[PDB]
Every structure is written in structure tokens, then in C-alpha cells.
Amino acid sequence: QEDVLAKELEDVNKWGLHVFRIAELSGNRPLTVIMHTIFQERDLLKTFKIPVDTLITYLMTLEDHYHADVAYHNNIHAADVVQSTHVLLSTPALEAVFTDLEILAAIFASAIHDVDHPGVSNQFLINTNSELALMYNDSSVLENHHLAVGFKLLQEENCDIFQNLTKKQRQSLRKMVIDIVLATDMSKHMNLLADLKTMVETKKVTSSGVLLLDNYSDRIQVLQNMVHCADLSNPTKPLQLYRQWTDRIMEEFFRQGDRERERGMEISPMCDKHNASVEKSQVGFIDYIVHPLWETWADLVHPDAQDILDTLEDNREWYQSTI
């Protein structure tokens, strides 16, 4: 009866999980069911003494603060970034290299990293003197808000899934989550990438193949770029998944650019439904953002990202052929 959903969830460790089906089958609860699954799969419930009712309560409360009428930045994208991060943590070239806490931080960060997203960009909120941009002084406006909401919901009744962490564990986790989610701001992508390249060229490895990071500065930079890769992972997924992500982001962009066209603002790139090319935008997005980032990641974890980089370059070739 649920074995449909339970059998899809069987793919939780595979790139290209059937996240849109899992959303439909779970009762529009992909974030809740996928997080629940991923915690079991790595046994985080018993490693950190999380009451299961408390996990589900938090997850469902969290998922509820993702906007169902926002086409891209909703609970499905959160579920997909969670699950993506989860695979990238299990890559050979990085195994047993992060704590149970650093693992908990990256996955919790992925889950909350877009919560309460209103469907419009940081630049839109800035230009419209929004209450959000006023609160956060125009700097990483959305990303600060996702964090603040993600942490605030822990205080709702029976939602504190970190109640049995030590207090310095809670402090360490809190800081890592903030560093990670703030890194999802696209205005930080360029410097985040140069730092990733830097680490790649001066990289160090073991005999079995596993990577050598000695200080927090470098390890959080990897977890940052990791969740950042998961956030920009849509063009690396199988094409039938990627295409649905393209429909959704463009719906959201167009729904934004309409509001910029009433208000009389410059319509943002790719948001003018009357002049944009959906396909050319994907090729540029791949050429200039996704492929530079994922090529560098693939080096860092070489061999491990080749099947992912493979799919990305196929998907790029296909989108180009539609032009």
C-alpha cells in the first residue's frame, strides 16, 4: 500500500532518486520522509538520542514552512538537496572523513537551506525595500532568513531534535550550519569556487584514495561547496528529472519578472517570459556556473564524480540540441 513509497525510498543513496514520485506518494511530504529515512540509514537517531516523534514533529513543521505555491524553492527542492548532499557525503574519496556531527550539520543545513522562501531573489527583496532586506541590511537576505526560521522552529513544542547533544556540540553544529547555509548565497559562488580550486591544486590523499583535510577552515569549505553543489545539482540528474526542475525554476522566475514589470523595475535576467530562451539559459547556467563548479568537485573526489559529470555533459549536449 505504502510499499510504493517504501520501494522508491529504497533508492535513497542513489543519484537520481525519484523525488517527484516520492513527493506524490508521501502525501506531499518528501522532505519529512527523505530526512527520516536518511537519519535511519546513517543511524543518527540513536547516535544523537533523537526521539523519533520529535524528529517527525520538527520535520513536518519545517516542511510546512516551505511554500507550496512556490514552483521551485519548495519542500521538493529541499528534499532533493538533502538527498543529494547525503550521497556526496558517502563518496569513497570522503568516507569516514566527517564526524557524525559534521554529517548532521550538512544534512540539517540542506533541509533548512531555503525554508520560507517567498519565490523571489535577494535582489528583488533589496530593490523593493522589503521587510526582509530591511531586517538583514541587504546582505544574504534570504539565506539569513532560512537559517533563522530553521533554528527557530526547533523551539516549537517537541521539535528540539538536538535536545540530547552536549552544549558545545550544539554550538559547533549551529556554527557549521550557519557557515554552510550562508555559503548557498550565489553572490559567494565565485570566491567559494576559487577556494575550491585552490584546495584541489594543493590537495593531499591517502593510499586507499581518501582525502586529507587537517583544519576546520578547509573542511567547512568542502561541506560548503558540497551543499552548494547539491543546490546546483539539477543539471547533473537524469534528464527527465532535470527537465522538471527547469520547468519549475522558470515558472518561478517568470512569476517574479511579472511583478518586476508591474512595479516598473528592470526585469531580472531570465524572468521576462516575453523574451527569454529557457534552453539557452540552461546552457549558460551549465557553461558558466554548474560545470565549472562540478568539474572542480570531480577533481577533489576523483574518480568519484565521473558518473555525475558524465550525466551533466550529456544533459548539456541535449539542451544545446534543442536550440
Ligand X SMILES: CCn1c(=O)c2c(c3ccc(C)nc31)O[C@@](C)(C/C=N/O)C[C@H]2C=C(C)C
> Would you name the residues annotated as active-site residues?
73
CB nearer to a second copy: give 14 or 152: 152
Q: Does 88 bind ligand X (CB under 6 A)?
A: no
Cell of 255: 512569476
Residue 227 grid cell? 551543499
Longest dimension (CA), the chain: 60
Give the DSSP per-residue string, 69-119.
Answer: T-SSTTHHHHHHHHHHHHHHHT-GGGTT-S-HHHHHHHHHHHHHTTTT--S
Rounded to the nearest whole angstrom, what is the least distance from the CB of residue 148 to a second copy in the complex? 5
Bridge partner list, 101: none
Closer CB to ligand X, 193 or 289, in the complex: 289
- Nearest approach in angstroms of CB 14 to Mg ion is 24
Provide, rounded to whole angstroms, the least separation between the CB of residue 77 and a second copy: 21
Candidates 8, 114, 160, 304; binder of ligand X (CB under 6 A) is 114
Rounded CA-CA distance 239/192 in Å is: 27
Q: Which residues bind Mg ion (CB under 5 A)?
A: 114, 184
Q: Is 113 annotated as a binding residue?
A: yes
Closest CA to 163 of 58, 67, 24, 16: 58
Question: Which of Zn ion, ligand X, Mg ion, none sits in contact with 285, Cβ below 5 to 8 A by type?
Answer: ligand X
Let me know: does 242 contact 253? Beta carbons within 8 Å.
Answer: no
Stretch that binds Zn ion, among 31-39, 161-169, 229-237, 290-298 (CB under 5 A): 229-237
**274 annotated among ligand-binding-site residues:** no
Contact 45, 55 (CB under 8 A): yes
Site string for ligand X, 244-263 (x = CB under 6 A): -xx--x--------------
How far apart are alpha carbons 249 and 72 in whole angstroms? 5
Contact 38, 107 (CB under 8 A): yes
CB of 210 to ligand X, least distance (A): 30
- CB of 131 vs a second copy, minimal distance in Å: 9
Find the part of the chain contacting ligand X (CB under 6 A) among 1-9, 37-45, 160-168, 243-251: 243-251
Tally of helices (H runs) and strands (E runs) in the chain: 17, 0
| Residue 282 labelled as part of a binding site | yes
Identified binder of ligand X from the candidate list 234, 296, 311, 315, rule CB under 6 A: 234
- CA dist 121 and 142 (Å) reads 8
73 near ligand X, judged by CB under 6 A = yes
Strand partners, 211: 205
Point out which residues bind ligand X (CB under 6 A).
73, 77, 114, 186, 231, 234, 245-246, 249, 270, 281, 285, 289
Point out which residues bind Zn ion (CB under 5 A).
114, 231
